């Protein structure tokens, strides 16, 4: 978990109704919310403050309140000149990513109606090839008439973000680098055809996300199974199911870092 992502999503439905929400993340793990009623940061865990003082965090909180209102208003002002374009939605992903012995990554990326619009490279706002003249002319504005904004973004993603991320990772090591063991079980039901029998090996409640669940005849893997998606539980753990179709004659393995080199073997009948 080496990257802090602060996301915004801005929805412009009418020239009278637009809306801004945002959150902070270690990958899939949410560390921060935003109460738009009060314009405040929600610290979801008691380590969500990292090594930063209340004063540094209050200062950032107000910057975000002003930005959220300001970006929303600046867009609403340019868009209300053509009610035809509504509704539309703008997304922002900003943050950083650490790599031992390297300069940290810093990024600020923007989407418009679900597609890349533009991003921040070095000190320049570069348009997406795919967003054509819209992207091009928005980048001209930011590069020529929002240098104050550019300097703020640079500093946030290249100076503040790495510092914050290190403090956040340090404060929450135990939870982020925790091991939680999967419960595993087998179940049966008829198929809608073919062999007419579905064997389902399940694993749920494991953390972290790397996991290996493969059906196996003797010590030999059994190919041709349907691998599920690794899906989230509300506790941050994950779920996975793997399906072997059979014509019903006569084992599913479960591997995870939390099992300390002792896999879970279920046999079935």
């Amino acid at each position: 978990h080496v990257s802090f992502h602060v996301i915004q999503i801005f929805s412009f439905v009418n020239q009278s109704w637009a809306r801004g929400q945002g959150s902070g993340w270690l990958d899939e793990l949410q560390t921060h919310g935003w109460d738009s009623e009060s314009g405040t940061i929600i610290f979801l865990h008691n380590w969500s403050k990292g090594n930063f003082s209340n004063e540094e965090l209050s200062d950032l909180e107000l910057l975000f309140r002003f930005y959220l209102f300001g970006l929303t208003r600046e867009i609403q002002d340019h868009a209300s000149q053509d009610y035809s374009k509504y509704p539309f939605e703008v997304q922002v992903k900003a943050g950083c990513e650490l790599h031992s012995g390297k300069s940290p990554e810093g990024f600020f990326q923007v989407a418009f109606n679900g597609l890349d619009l533009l991003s921040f490279q070095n000190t320049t706002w570069v348009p997406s090839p795919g967003c054509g003249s819209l992207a091009q002319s928005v980048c001209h504005l930011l590069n020529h008439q929002y240098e104050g904004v550019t300097e703020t973004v640079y500093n946030l993603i290249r100076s503040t973000c790495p510092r914050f991320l290190l403090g956040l990772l340090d404060a929450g090591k135990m939870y982020v680098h925790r091991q939680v063991r999967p419960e595993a079980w087998l179940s049966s039901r008829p198929s809608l055809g073919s062999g007419q029998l579905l064997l389902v090996c399940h694993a749920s409640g494991f953390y972290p996300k790397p996991v290996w669940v493969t059906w196996m005849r003797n010590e030999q893997e059994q190919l041709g199974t349907k691998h599920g998606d690794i899906l989230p539980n509300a506790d941050g753990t994950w779920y996975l199911q793997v399906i072997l179709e059979v014509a019903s004659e006569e084992s599913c393995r479960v591997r995870h870092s939390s099992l300390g080199g002792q896999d879970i073997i279920l046999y079935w009948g």
């Epitope: 200062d59 910057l63 309140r65 002003f66 208003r73 904004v149 703020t152 946030l156």
Partner: T-cell receptor, first 116, second 112 residues
Framework: DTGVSQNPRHKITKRGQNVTFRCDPI?????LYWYRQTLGQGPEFLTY????????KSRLLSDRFSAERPKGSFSTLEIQRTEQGDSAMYLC?????????????FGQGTRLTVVE | NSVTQMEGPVTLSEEAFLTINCTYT??????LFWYVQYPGEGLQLLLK?????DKGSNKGFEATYRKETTSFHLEKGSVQVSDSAVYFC????????????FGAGTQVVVTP
């Protein structure tokens, strides 16, 4: 050079009375601040308007104090039930939209004297 | 308050070197400023520095944004009687987007 305009320039009020101060920022300044200043001290922040939206008030702001900027332009500041300690210079400042490190343009203030 | 400036008054004669000390506690990419209030007048900006190591200059007054010493000292080589005023150090937080936060002010009295 038409700068920030504040009215009235001075105001005496009897303790217990309400007063309303007015500020007209520099044309189109999106950012508007109200501060309070007592002789011998620097301006103390009261509240900040971005356009019409009041995005920050001082934590120590009294419930007696309320400000408004209904059209993102002129602002009003009302103090209810004045007290001697409310006596001070009430400063309005405006700053341009989208300029970092911006200068704050101060008015000449409403000088408030609360008398018994 | 995160802006602390020299207690005044500072009294010196015309042609003397003036120094008003100002220290601050701030975060990220803040901006520093010096405001001046001449007798019977409103506040107005004297000089400003938006980025680290930027020197703000105006009418012989100068102040350098010095991160590593947390300083925005106001200097003027050779003061004139008309420089008699109150000087306020100030800090815009929210990475230079926020309200000015002022020090208490330092009165300068320049004697003939």
């Amino acid at each position: 050079d038409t700068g920030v305009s504040q009215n009235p320039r001075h105001k005496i009020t009897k303790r217990g009375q309400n007063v309303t101060f007015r500020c007209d920022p520099i044309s189109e300044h999106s950012r508007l601040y109200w501060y309070r200043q007592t002789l011998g001290q620097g301006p103390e922040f009261l509240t900040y308007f971005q356009n019409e939206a009041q995005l920050e008030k001082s934590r120590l702001l009294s419930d007696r104090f309320s400000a408004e900027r209904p059209k993102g332009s002129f602002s009003t500041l009302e103090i209810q039930r004045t007290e001697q300690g409310d006596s001070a210079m009430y400063l309005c400042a405006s700053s341009p939209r989208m300029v970092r490190g911006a200068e704050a343009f101060f008015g000449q203030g409403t000088r408030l004297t609360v008398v018994e | 308050n995160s802006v602390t400036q020299m207690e005044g008054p500072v009294t010196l004669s015309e042609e003397a070197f003036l120094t008003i000390n100002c220290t601050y506690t701030a975060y990220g990419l803040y901006s520093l400023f010096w405001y001046v209030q001449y007798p019977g007048e409103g506040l107005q900006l004297l000089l400003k520095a938006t980025k680290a190591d930027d020197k703000g200059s105006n009418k012989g007054f100068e102040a350098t944004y010095r991160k590593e010493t947390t300083s925005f000292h106001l200097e003027k080589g050779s003061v004139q009687v008309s420089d008699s005023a109150v000087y306020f150090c100030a800090l815009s937080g929210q990475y230079g987007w926020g309200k000015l936060q002022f020090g208490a002010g330092t009165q300068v009295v320049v004697t003939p």
